[PDB]
From a paper:
Lysophosphatidylserine (LysoPS) is a naturally occurring lipid mediator involved in various physiological and pathological processes especially those related to the immune system. GPR174 primarily couples to the stimulatory G protein Gs, whereas GPR34 exclusively couples to the inhibitory G protein Gi/o, both of which exert their effects by regulation of cAMP level in cells.
Mutagenesis studies using a Gi-dissociation assay in HEK293T cells with both 18:1 and 18:0 LysoPS revealed that several residues in contact with the polar head of LysoPS are critical for LysoPS-induced activation of GPR34, including Y1353.33, F205ECL2, R2866.55, Y2896.58, E3097.35, and E3107.36, which severely impaired receptor activation when mutated to alanine. The coupling mode between GPR34 and Gi resembles that of many Gi/o-coupled class A GPCRs such as rhodopsin and cannabinoid receptor CB2. However, TM6 of GPR34 exhibits a smaller outward displacement at the intracellular end of TM6, which results in a more upright pose of the α5 helix. The C terminus of α5 inserts into a cavity mainly formed by TM3, TM6, and the linkage between TM7 and H8.
Author numbering:
A (entry chain E): 1 to 120, 137 to 247
B (entry chain C): 6 to 62
C (entry chain A): 4 to 53, 182 to 354
D (entry chain R): 50 to 157, 167 to 339
E (entry chain B): 2 to 343
Write the structure that this text describes.
């Protein structure tokens, strides 16, 4: 089965260095681009770095550029993140994310379990922080972007993720309308221009969690604040 | 006895093909002409679309 | 002017072209041989020495060979013979001991003459104008034994030569090479093989190398 | 210049007629008859183009000798046509240097061939601009004549650049001799080892064609560049008027021989390649 | 005695069928469509050139989205193309390089191919591992695989060189129905728009109409003088066109049970490899051995235009479901996308 196991996290002193590893099994690692995404405690998701398939393209976030180095070992199916000059702002759970890019693909479909590190631009807005919900009732979640995510090729590069309590984020909607594999049809993504809505018909207990909207129109990838659903 | 067995099958097959209902060629020709006329406007190869509507600019 | 995922899709295509280029380079260094002949003519014995199409891979002196056997297909030959246009050479197997035999299916056609019509069509085929032929004459030891009992006059009525093995073997070789109606574009390499022979692979390597070198001399424009 | 002008007018007329007809037919084969090309045929396409441009420069030189060495088209056009002739003569030499290197490797890549030709054309074009700029900047050129002997006392930079080309030629001609000799001897021994085979005379014939390419390149180009060192040194040093006109006559006659390769480049490829002979016949 | 008597009855039945067809041949399609205006000159330009195949291309098939297509070449590579951008979406290495046909599933989740190996291999395009893998190898044919067409994700029809066509259950890997009756190698097949019938052309110069569910031959169409290499249903399913080695294309009608029109020219002396219709069916595009693709007027049998952009045989062609463009594959290892301009 598809697996992504992170290791190397732990308590480090400020200004130190730490090496994060992501071992991949059950899929063609060399065919997938890889991202590092971190989540500060009691905070939302934050994109860190990206390395393409074949290691030809590498991108970094501005807050980490120059201090973090991302690399991969295709024969060993291992993804690396070399970190230096670690600050207290870097204390977060770091997730290993696979993403393949071709016509009709679903990037960000699988997330790793994450590793915890403790140290001693289009704006995506989710104004509604929390929504009280009851099972069997329809819920809508709204997302906004400072720039239009609709490209001239007809795609709207908006993604929806669900992070259940204690679990890694899961892809629900990719490119603002398509439903991710393994996701019930009750989830539906609708949007236009800068305003997007995620409709959840017949809400269930499993749907409880935090929902993040991410833009993939251009780098750096930015996440919304997140909308929490509670019973 | 392979040839005699094949002969029985071939004769039986020709009976099925000979019992079908056939319409006139003029009736069949009119339907082909009618179908082309009805869908002529929505045929990009017959009537090329403006460059704005052409995905292969 | 591309999106973020569009620029990543193009990079994926560029990697595909890189792998396609590498596979083309690897495939262009391999010798492809089309193995032909009649049934029970020693062809099976050749494969050992070296329901659709049977492919055999072997390496000899830093050279990789691909041998394609299409004797198991009873369909129309002209509907798939163009698929082998471009092989390095054609390995044609002829059984010398079958000169006095009669074709089992037809019951009135000489077995040796059945090989000539197969050889004539392949050699003069429009898809193999520039393809050399490696003619293997198998069963030479059994051919000598049948010579003493059954003379070559049965196979060739207009054969005034002696009944010795050397004269009989050379006459058959000349008849096959005379079926080549294009003696300039292509060349025919004739070898006398046997069940116990071990130099058959060497002759293929020598003949293939001769074909490969003469292909370069045409590319360079010096020939 | 009574005898020399008569010889050049007839000599260049023969080259122009054979060169224009010969190269156009060659330019047809590489474009029309052939759809896919290998590295060798890529170079020979550009050699045909370079030799064709050299042929189009001949009518300007022919018309000059017809009017008894009276030039009227202007100083700007005389320098453009005069430098364009030498530009294409050294594109052929450089490319034929690459053909010998390409043939040597194959006997003893299409994308890499196209880059080589584009680099050569751009580098050769830059040299064409360099000569034009260095020659027109001085601005001491009479409009009454062209293609004449010039003692370049005040144009030492122009003469030194020419000297580099002559040294550049002897590096390429060394490569051509070192390759076609190795090709010819490689195919001669192979014919000895493979004597017993259905066709062993192909290697002997192919090795013969290797020496014919070397001989045509040697006969056409070596006499000109061997004497060019004398021609350059006479321009710089002070020499007698009698000696100066001997060097001019020798250079112009050898320049006819050097131009004759523009006709023997297509003809040599037609006869050596059996494919083109069969296609024509 | 019995054999001689039976073969005389077959001739009587053939005469009965021939008389029945002649009885309903009151008029000709040419006479009916004489009054209508011609389509004029059809000019198509090469919008895209798909490069990357290193050998002869033998088959191509559009996906139902009119954007993705799969092509097969005998370099042992199945390639899926994004026709809008010319990007390569996948490159599937084939176990057997002697591929002769390829098909794109209407759902887009599977592709199929097969050749001289007598096997139809099904490839899964949507896997969690991110690569294309073989999902099924359909064995059972005793000759080379010449054509294959999906009915859905679980059913596929294949024609082989063993003179038979088969309907396969992909999940079980077994051929549920076998279609016998051709006396030569079946070279092509075309599915009806409702996927309840399909026509196949063989080397016996005859085209047979088969019932998928019932499993028998309903009608037999003759008239060609050489092997049929290509066949394509009319968009309404009531007619089909064939292409043979005799340099002719013929339009047969299912309900009239006879040929309606012949598409041939005196200059054309080469065999035909592929045929297809435009979305409205007014244009018949045929690929030829003379390196060209001729666009015919289906109703008036006039050569509307020529697609001359290949240096070897045009081995395959296909028109998108929306009718926007036509792709041509060729032995020169290139694919080209064509459409006109206002
Ligand atoms: C001042 C002028 C006359 C100098 C000559 C300019 C022209 C004739 C030269 C300069 C650049 C040359 C081109 C450079 C590169 C190529 C690609 C090659 O695969 C075909 C020949 C071709 C296309 C050349 C054709 C001739 C060319 C266009």
């Amino acid at each position: 089965d598809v697996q992504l196991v992170e290791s190397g996290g732990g308590l480090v002193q400020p200004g130190g260095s730490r090496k994060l590893s992501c071992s991949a099994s059950g899929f063609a690692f060399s065919s997938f681009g890889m991202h590092w995404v971190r989540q500060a405690p009691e905070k939302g998701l934050e994109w860190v770095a990206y390395i393409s398939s074949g290691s030809g393209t590498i991108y970094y976030a501005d807050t980490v550029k120059g201090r973090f180095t991302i690399s991969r070992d295709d024969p060993k199916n291992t993804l690396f993140l070399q970190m230096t000059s670690l600050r207290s702002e870097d204390t977060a759970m770091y997730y290993c994310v696979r993403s393949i890019y071709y016509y009709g693909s679903s990037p960000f479909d699988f997330w790793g379990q994450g590793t915890t590190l403790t140290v001693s631009d289009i704006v995506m807005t989710q104004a509604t922080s929390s929504v009280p919900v009851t099972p069997g009732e329809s819920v809508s979640i709204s997302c906004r972007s400072s720039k239009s995510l609709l490209h001239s090729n007809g795609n709207t590069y908006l993604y929806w993720f669900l992070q259940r309590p204690g679990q890694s984020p899961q892809l629900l909607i990719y490119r603002m309308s398509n439903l991710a594999s393994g996701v019930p049809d009750r989830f539906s993504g609708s949007g236009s221009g800068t305003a997007f809505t995620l409709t959840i018909s017949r809400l269930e207990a499993e749907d409880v969690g935090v929902y993040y909207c991410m833009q993939h129109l251009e780098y750096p990838l930015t996440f919304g604040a997140g909308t929490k659903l509670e019973l | 006895t392979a040839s005699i067995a094949q002969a029985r099958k071939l004769v039986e097959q020709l009976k099925m093909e000979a019992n079908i209902d056939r319409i006139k060629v003029s009736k069949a020709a009119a339907d082909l002409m009618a179908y082309c006329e009805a869908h002529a406007k929505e045929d990009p190869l017959l009537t090329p679309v403006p460059a704005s509507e052409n995905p292969f600019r | 002017t591309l999106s973020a995922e569009d620029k990543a899709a193009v990079e994926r295509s560029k990697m595909i072209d890189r792998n396609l280029r590498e596979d083309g380079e690897k495939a262009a260094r391999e010798v492809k041989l089309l193995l032909l002949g009649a049934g029970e003519s020693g062809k099976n014995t050749i494969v050992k020495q070296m329901t659709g199409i049977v492919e055999t891979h072997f390496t000899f002196k830093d050279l990789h060979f691909k041998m394609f056997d299409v004797g198991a297909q009873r369909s129309e030959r002209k509907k798939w013979i163009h698929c082998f246009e471009g092989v390095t050479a054609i390995i044609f197997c002829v059984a010398l001991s079958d000169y006095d035999l009669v074709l089992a299916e037809d019951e009135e056609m000489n077995r040796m003459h059945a090989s000539m019509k197969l050889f004539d069509s392949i050699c003069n085929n429009k898809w193999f104008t520039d393809t050399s032929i490696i003619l293997f004459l198998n069963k030479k030891d059994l051919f000598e034994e049948k010579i003493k009992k059954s003379p070559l006059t049965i196979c060739y009525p207009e054969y005034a030569g002696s009944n010795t093995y050397e004269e009989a073997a050379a006459y058959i070789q000349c008849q096959f090479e005379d079926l080549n109606k294009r003696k300039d574009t292509k060349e025919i390499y004739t070898h006398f093989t046997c069940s116990t022979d071990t130099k058959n692979v060497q002759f293929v390597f020598d003949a293939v190398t001769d074909v490969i070198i003469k292909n370069n001399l045409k590319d360079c424009g010096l020939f | 210049e009574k005898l020399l002008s008569t010889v050049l007018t007839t000599s260049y007329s023969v080259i122009f007629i054979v060169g224009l007809v010969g190269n156009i037919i060659a330019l047809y084969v590489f474009l029309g008859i052939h759809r896919k090309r290998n590295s060798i045929q890529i170079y020979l396409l550009n050699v045909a183009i370079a030799d064709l441009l050299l042929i189009f420069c001949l009518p300007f030189r022919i018309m000059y000798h017809i009017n008894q060495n009276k030039w009227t088209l202007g100083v700007i056009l005389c320098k453009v046509v005069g430098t364009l002739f030498y530009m294409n003569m050294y594109i052929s030499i450089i490319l034929l240097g690459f053909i010998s290197l390409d043939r040597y490797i194959k006997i003893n890549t299409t994308k890499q061939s196209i880059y080589v030709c584009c680099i050569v054309w751009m580098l050769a074009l830059g040299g064409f601009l360099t000569m034009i700029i260095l020659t027109l900047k001085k601005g001491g050129h009479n409009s009454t004549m062209c293609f004449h002997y010039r003692d370049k006392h005040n144009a030492k930079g122009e003469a030194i650049f020419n000297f580099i080309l002559v040294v550049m030629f002897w590096l390429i001609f060394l490569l051509i001799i070192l390759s076609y000799i190795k090709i010819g001897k490689n195919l001669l021994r192979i014919s000895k080892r493979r004597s017993k085979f259905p066709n062993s005379g192909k290697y002997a014939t192919t090795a013969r064609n290797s020496f014919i390419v070397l001989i045509i390149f040697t006969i056409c180009f070596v006499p000109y560049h061997a004497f060019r060192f004398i021609y350059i040194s006479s321009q710089l040093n002070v020499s007698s008027c009698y000696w100066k006109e001997i060097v001019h006559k020798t250079n112009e006659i050898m320049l006819v021989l050097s131009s004759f390769n523009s006709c023997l480049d297509p003809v040599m490829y037609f006869l050596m390649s059996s494919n083109i002979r069969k296609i024509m016949c | 005695s019995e054999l001689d008597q039976l073969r005389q009855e077959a001739e009587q039945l053939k005469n009965q069928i021939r008389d029945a067809r002649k009885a309903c041949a009151d008029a000709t399609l040419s006479q009916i469509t004489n009054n209508i205006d011609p389509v004029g000159r059809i000019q198509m330009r090469t919008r895209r050139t798909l490069r990357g195949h290193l050998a002869k291309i033998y088959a191509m098939h559009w996906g139902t989205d009119s954007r993705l297509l799969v092509s097969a070449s005998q370099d042992g590579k199945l390639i899926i193309w994004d026709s809008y951008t010319t990007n390569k979406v996948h490159a599937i290495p084939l176990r057997s390089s002697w591929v002769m046909t390829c098909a794109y599933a209407p759902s887009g989740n599977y592709v199929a191919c097969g050749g001289l190996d007598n096997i139809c291999s099904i490839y899964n395009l949507k896997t969690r591992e991110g690569n294309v893998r073989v999902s099924r190898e359909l064995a059972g044919h005793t000759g080379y695989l010449s054509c294959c067409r999906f009915l859905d994700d679980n059913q596929i029809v294949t024609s082989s060189g063993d003179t038979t066509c088969a309907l396969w259950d992909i999940e079980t890997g077994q051929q549920t129905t076998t279609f016998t009756g051709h006396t030569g190698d079946v070279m092509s097949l075309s599915l009806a728009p409702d996927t309840r019938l399909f026509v196949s052309g063989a080397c016996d110069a005859s085209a047979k109409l088969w019932d998928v569910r019932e499993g028998m031959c309903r009608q037999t169409f003759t008239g060609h003088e050489s092997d049929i290499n290509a066949i394509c249903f009319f968009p309404n399913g009531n007619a089909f066109a064939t292409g043979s080695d005799d340099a002719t294309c013929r339009l047969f009608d299912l309900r009239a049970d006879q040929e309606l029109m012949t598409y041939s020219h005196d200059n054309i002396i080469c065999g035909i490899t592929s045929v297809s219709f435009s979305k409205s069916g007014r244009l018949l595009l045929a690929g030829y051995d003379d390196f060209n693709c001729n666009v015919w007027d289906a109703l008036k049998a006039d050569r509307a235009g020529v697609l001359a952009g290949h240096d070897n045989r045009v081995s395959c062609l296909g028109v998108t479901d929306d009718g926007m463009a036509v792709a041509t594959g060729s032995w020169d290892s290139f694919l080209k996308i064509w459409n006109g301009s206002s």
